């Protein structure tokens, strides 16, 4: 079962990267093509493989998979929230970055008008994408990543006013305010997490014996 | 530990009902009064007892606990979303109903303009508040409860147009549309669930070996 779940997980990863190649090539893709990429008895599990792969694209890569033909089941791709950026570079196999960008925007959005950089590092250091390589000579990968977002004008970075010694904070840049909004981003994070997950308290926490 | 968690849970229930009595009496309450109601070594755990009790009031009872004096730590109460209804009856010790009302409104809101009654029963039958007494002679308690919400004009109940044999659906009534909105309700459910809970997929689900 644990061995089965892992094997199932592997089939998800394969569909994700099948779809990523289509995304890069800007090729529309049918459900029949996706099902065709899944081999053998695993086709029986295509519904969960598809929905898991589809969720991965949104959450991890910031990529939306949209059906434009409900009869022939033809899908196209779009960047989440309609952003004009995915952080790619030619055909180099580097990771699409819009999902990570949206996560940073969201962290800031929950904190108000701006967030101390320490909160950003704290929240980002949890993501397994950085695979514990913060001791890189070139510099902490997660910090160099946020520099992309600043230089693309999705983020601004400044000294906290009146701070001594200097502290620094992130805020939304002009490009983020144009292409989306606070509400849209926080709504998006809810949507792609599978709605709100309400842990209802047990009876003995609100009923007296 | 399991025995400790349960004992801790019991202290939460006691604070909840301490606060409920204040709520019924429309008495403001200080943090010092709350801490005073907690006995002995359990005072060391007041922060988690408070936050758990505070969340219970919102989620279960539809009651907001609001600090109006940040210096003396004086709190008052309000109905969640500002609704003019809590479903109480004099000093009879029956459960405040606004939390259950908001949950029903939310179920409908997620489904669009209306929801089949079967979806309502399905979602409601999960709540432990009904303690498996759906076989009551008087009628299924959860169904009789929604009748309160209809008669108070928070909900409307009608036959699904063109259904044969007749099927039925719930929708927001005039009173719900006046006092709140779809957006506000779904936002509220997120807020009181402790933000969106994002289960990020494991590396082997989106990285190839």
Numbering used by the authors:
A (entry chain A), B (entry chain A): 102 to 310
What does the paper say about this structure?
Crystals of the MAGE-A3 MHD domain were obtained using a construct spanning residues 104–314, and diffracted to 2.0 Å resolution at Diamond light source beamline I24. The structure was solved by molecular replacement using the experimentally phased structure of MAGE-A4 as a search model. The final 15 residues at the C-terminus form an extended peptide, with a short section of 310 helix, which in the MAGE-A3 crystals forms an extensive interaction with a neighbouring molecule related by 2-fold crystallographic symmetry. In MAGE-A3 the interface area is ~1650 Å2 per monomer, consists of a mixture of polar and non-polar residues, and includes 5 unique hydrogen bonds, 1 salt bridge and two prominent aromatic residues, Tyr 301 and Trp 307, that protrude deep in the groove and make extensive van der Waals interactions with hydrophobic residues. In contrast to MAGEA4, PISA analysis of MAGE-A3 identified two potential biologically relevant dimer interfaces. In addition to the peptide interface detailed above (“dimer A”) a second interface is formed almost entirely by interactions from the second WH domain. This interface (“dimer B”) is only slightly less extensive (~1400 Å2 of interface area versus ~1650 Å2) and is formed by the extended β-hairpin connecting the two WH domains, together with the third helix on the second WH domain (α6) and the extended loop regions immediately preceding and following it. Comparing this data to the calculated data obtained using the monomeric MAGE-A3, dimer A and dimer B models reveals a significantly better fit for dimer B than either dimer A or monomer, when comparing either in reciprocal or real space (chi2 of 1.99 versus 4.94 or 2.6 respectively). Taken together it is clear that MAGE-A3 is predominantly a dimer in solution and that dimer corresponds to dimer B, although it is possible that at higher concentrations these dimeric units may further associate via the C-terminal peptide to form larger open ended oligomers.
All MAGE family members contain a shared core MAGE homology domain (MHD) which is a ~ 200 amino acid long domain, which is well conserved across the entire MAGE family (individual human MHD’s share more than 40% sequence identity). The MHD domain structure consists of two highly modified winged helix WH domains WH1 and WH2 in a tandem arrangement linked by an extended β-hairpin. The biochemical basis for this activity appears to be exerted through binding to and modulating the activities of RING domain containing E3 ubiquitin ligases. Rather, each MAGE protein appears to recognize a unique region on its RING partner, suggesting that MAGE proteins are able to function as a versatile and adaptable protein interaction module.
